[PDB]
Amino acid sequence: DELYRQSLEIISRYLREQATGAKDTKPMGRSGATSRKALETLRRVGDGVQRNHETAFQGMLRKLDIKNEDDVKSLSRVMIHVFSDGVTNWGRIVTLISFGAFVAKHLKTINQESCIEPLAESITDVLVRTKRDWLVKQRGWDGFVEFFH
Ligand SMILES: Cc1cc(OCCCc2c3n(c4c(-c5c(C)nn(C)c5C)c(Cl)ccc24)CCCN(c2cccc4c(C(=O)O)cn(C)c24)C3=O)cc(C)c1Cl
């Protein structure tokens, strides 16, 4: 119940603060410090990988044809297909979240900023439902931060 809350918190914060250039006006909620270290890891690595995959991400966005929140409810299935099953590791996870961050930037640009919030949820939903057991075998986000030092 709570690990989903933690992950969702991190992703929503990262996506918003990537979309807007701001750094939030408060700290984090319950389990806040681990979530902060995760968010700063994201700050570094997400921008790096987004720069590396600018071409593929930008062409995919060119395809995705996103207009409103209904598009958000219809994109989760493409996200699931691309993230699917097979090789599981932290790099693919940060890549998931990083494409979420680019999508959030774009949504703010088209003034459809309100769609950033369901997006994160969808990401987070797909993130837990598909990797839950493995995440606990990584003691959650602890495996994340320690991996990326
Ligand atoms: C529609 C949508 C999806 C989203 O993300 C879904 C998963 C992330 C993603 C992947 N990929 C994406 C691509 C993409 C496509 C399609 N083609 N190319 C060349 C790229 C870069 C795009 Cl454009 C956007 C997101 C992703 C494919 C290549 C990277 N990867 C990958 C595959 C296999 C092994 C490894 C690997 C290792 O070695 O362990 C490390 N990673 C990075 C690997 C992906 O799973 C997110 C949101 C919010 C939305 Cl709404």
Swiss-Prot record:
Q: What is the effect of changing K63R?
A: No effect on ubiquitination
Question: Its biological function?
Answer: Involved in the regulation of apoptosis versus cell survival, and in the maintenance of viability but not of proliferation. Mediates its effects by interactions with a number of other regulators of apoptosis. Isoform 1 inhibits apoptosis. Isoform 2 promotes apoptosis.
Cross-link annotation Glycyl lysine isopeptide (Lys-Gly) (interchain with G-Cter in ubiquitin), location? K23, K26
Listed under subunit, the entry gives: Interacts with HIF3A (via C-terminus domain). Interacts with BAD, BOK, BIK and BMF. Interacts with PMAIP1. Interacts with BBC3. Isoform 1 interacts with BAX, BAK1 and TPT1. Heterodimer of isoform 1 and isoform 2. Homodimers of isoform 1 or isoform 2 are not detected. Isoform 2 does not interact with pro-apoptotic BCL2-related proteins. Interacts with RTL10/BOP. Interacts with BCL2L11; may sequester BCL2L11 to prevent its pro-apoptotic activity. Interacts with GIMAP5 and HSPA8/HSC70; the interaction between HSPA8 and MCL1 is impaired in the absence of GIMAP5.
Q: What is the effect of changing K23R?
A: Reduced ubiquitination
Q: Which family does it belong to?
A: Belongs to the Bcl-2 family.
Compartments (UniProt record): Membrane; Cytoplasm; Mitochondrion; Nucleus, Nucleoplasm
Q: Induced by what?
A: Expression increases early during phorbol ester-induced differentiation along the monocyte/macrophage pathway in myeloid leukemia cell line ML-1. Rapidly up-regulated by CSF2 in ML-1 cells. Up-regulated by heat shock-induced differentiation. Expression increases early during retinoic acid-induced differentiation.
Q: Which organism is it from?
A: Homo sapiens
The residue numbers the entry assigns to motif BH2 are 133-148
Q: What is this protein called?
A: Induced myeloid leukemia cell differentiation protein Mcl-1
Coverage span on the entire protein: 172 to 320 of 350
- Motif BH1: where in chain: 81-101
Chain ranges for the short sequence motif BH3 as given in the UniProt record: 38-52
**What does UniProt say on post-translational modification here?**
Cleaved by CASP3 during apoptosis. Treatment with taxol or okadaic acid induces phosphorylation on additional sites.
